[PDB]
Design a protein around this ligand. Structure first.
Ligand SMILES: [Mg+2]
Ligand SMILES: [Mg+2]
Ligand SMILES: [Mg+2]
Length: 339
């Protein structure tokens, strides 16, 4: 039973969950990949890895993706989570020197993953491994776009580092622009393309309906995460959260911020439903009778479909993952899966 303050009746009724048939293998393989790359201690993987439901999230998102593509996505996503934890630990312990170097190593590895497959820092090598595999599905033009988007993500994380060390709480609009990058909105949007096995031309993917649908899907997830991860981010001295920016600047109380974030989350859903019609109508326009048009039509249709899936997958992920179960920790400021 989902708590009233986090419950979204629309998602439960209009957004039915889906699950990739490869998921059972996905869960085990990703777990093994975390062990082989040494991204987590062997006992924390045994204890927490499956309870984190990182593979569950992506398997309910990228439906119709080839197994190898889904695996690379899941491994990358798992790295993304342990990088968020390393980023958090570097801040609380004030390891600015360690962070700046890692930051630099990630930029370089992003451009040439092969050269960093066996780097001394396992976090860098784990990153290089998943990125190299992601670069093997689609032509170089896609890889370049991916790198370009993730270069921005790293800098956003660096910007987050400086804000938390100084104690600066971003403005509500300053946060919303930063949140699009720290949540990696366009990374997950790009990953839709190898999932449908097709790189979309700019004329297609920058179509207003496609753009808006992709955006709204990411905004919902990012903002619902802020709503659900709020208690664990309060206890961990995290300052990057929509609710926190409201309380700090707009002087809203703890309950006023929750309700305010809820309404923004609810708007995303109904706004998505409106543009989803336009996005799917555009998919029907692409099918002009040609083989090419048919391929582009199917890809967009599958992508928009996965944008929809994200809603249900994220929603149930925040109530099934042990990542946010702060109420069951001995030390609320230190998650047990984090080292
Ligand atoms: Mg975090
Ligand atoms: Mg973050
Ligand atoms: Mg969060």
């Amino acid at each position: 039973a989902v708590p009233p303050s986090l419950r979204l009746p629309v998602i439960e009724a209009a957004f039915p969950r889906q699950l990739h048939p490869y998921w059972p293998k996905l869960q085990e393989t990703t777990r093994t990949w975390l062990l082989e790359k040494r991204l987590m201690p062997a006992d924390k993987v045994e204890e927490y890895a499956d309870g984190l439901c990182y593979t569950d999230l992506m398997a309910g998102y990228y439906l119709g993706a080839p197994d190898e593509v889904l695996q690379a996505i899941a491994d990358y996503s798992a790295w993304f989570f342990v990088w968020d934890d390393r980023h958090d630990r570097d801040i609380v312990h004030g390891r600015a020197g360690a962070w700046r170097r890692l930051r630099g190593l990630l930029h370089t590895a992003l451009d040439s993953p092969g050269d960093h497959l066996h780097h001394e820092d396992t976090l860098v090598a784990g990153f290089a491994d998943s990125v190299r595999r992601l670069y093997a599905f689609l032509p170089a033009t896609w890889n370049a776009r991916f790198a370009r988007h993730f270069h921005t993500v790293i800098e956003a994380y660096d910007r987050e580092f400086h804000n938390r060390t100084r104690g600066i709480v971003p403005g509500v609009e300053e946060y919303l622009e930063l949140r699009r990058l720290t949540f990696a909105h366009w990374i997950w949007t790009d990953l839709l393309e190898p999932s449908s096995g097709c790189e979309l031309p700019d004329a297609v993917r920058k179509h207003p309906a496609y753009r808006r649908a992709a955006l709204l899907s990411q905004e919902f997830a990012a903002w619902y995460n802020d709503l659900c991860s709020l208690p664990k981010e309060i206890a961990g001295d995290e300052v990057h959260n929509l609710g926190i920016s409201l309380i700090t600047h707009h002087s809203l109380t703890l309950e006023e911020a929750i309700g305010e974030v809820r309404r923004r989350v609810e708007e995303c859903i109904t706004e998505f439903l409106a543009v989803e019609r336009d996005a799917l109508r555009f998919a029907d326009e692409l099918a002009d009778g040609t083989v090419r048009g048919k391929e582009l039509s199917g890809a967009v249709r599958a992508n928009v479909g996965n944008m929809r899936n994200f809603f249900s997958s994220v929603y149930w992920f925040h109530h099934e993952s042990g990542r946010y179960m702060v109420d069951s920790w001995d030390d609320r400021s230190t998650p047990p899966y984090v080292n």
